Design a protein around this nucleic acid. Sequence first.
DNA 1: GGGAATTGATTGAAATCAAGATAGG
DNA 2: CTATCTTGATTTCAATCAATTCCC
Lengths: 198, 198
Amino acid sequence: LVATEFSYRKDEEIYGEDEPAEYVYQVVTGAVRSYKLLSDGRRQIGAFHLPGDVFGLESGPSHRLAAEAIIDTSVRLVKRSSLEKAAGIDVQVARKLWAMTAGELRHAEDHMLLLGRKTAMERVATFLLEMDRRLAVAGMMALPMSRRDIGDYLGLTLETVSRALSQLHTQGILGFSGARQIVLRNRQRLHNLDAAAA
Amino acid sequence: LVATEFSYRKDEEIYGEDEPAEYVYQVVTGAVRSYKLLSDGRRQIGAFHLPGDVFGLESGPSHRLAAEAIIDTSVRLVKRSSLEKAAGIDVQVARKLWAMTAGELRHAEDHMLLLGRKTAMERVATFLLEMDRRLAVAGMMALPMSRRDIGDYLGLTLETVSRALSQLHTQGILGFSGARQIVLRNRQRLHNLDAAAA
DNA sequence: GGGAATTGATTGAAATCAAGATAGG
DNA sequence: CTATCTTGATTTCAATCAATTCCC
């Protein structure tokens, strides 16, 4: 129905893993990471949510990943129960909720293949192409997250990510204007470094 | 509504990647693997579907993973269009379909953490515990798949999986009655070798 | 009998350990 | 100024390469 606005500071938790899934959120400005942790501190980031993306939608009762703002972020949010009510009233709403979860599933399925099977360079080339599609403006990606967040998204250390980016820069495949301002100079070459579907 | 029966031989493809998602399936007997391939032959298994499990449900128009019988398998299946009609007629059907996809998402989220962050031994212990919960009979797991399928589910080589299983055996954690007949002797010790949540 | 599994030897890609260089605040 | 990022040195865990052995 009606959304309400809210903002979170860089690094503020928006919800925790296993916390009640009481609201559903949409990024207006900024960026959010969703992740799971192990007890010794190892962290897998499952997804980055960028402006316009919806997150926190759960069919069940609890958030299965924690979510934190990467940088100061403004979101819109709606009560989960308000969505459940609308879905009951309107077959089209119910179908759109399922579609949202299905798109999350498709992203996770592709991401399992990356984490289980791709080389470090393939993973970084995949990542740069995904970000270019999602956030490039007039050819340039202003990436909101650190090298440690990129590594924890890709199942790699930040040093390996840095090394792959350095190599791509030396080869003329990308340009830098500072470490997180990246301009892809040849998407085709970079596409050739990811792994290809059978 | 009305399900029909069908069977597939060991290694027969049930549907391909990117193929039209025309039917939804439930294992009655046997076992199925869902996977994605890369062009050089590398393979990530996203899930094993065991008796009673439903698979091949897509919100979108096509299968995002291929599916193959691991051993001779009997399934029940229904037309996807038949499900879409029931879901339009009944709010609880629509809701169950969303819940199915959401359970697949929860599995894939956990599995990303495993593929991105768990050591080889943690992955194998996770796998044995998952299979014990889903398929043990009076304490013993008759695993339907090869070591190569296990490694492709866990982002490991079959040799690494063999070594971890050998080690668990030598430590008294599991028993063998042949390679794929496994009896967990101490689930607590094995749970301690998986990695724990924060 | 023969694909599957175990086991051993070795390599290798990414992690870890360790300085510096960079550049946002 | 101080995190973040890059780069280098070295280690390590799992992969790869290579025979046997065990069972279906």
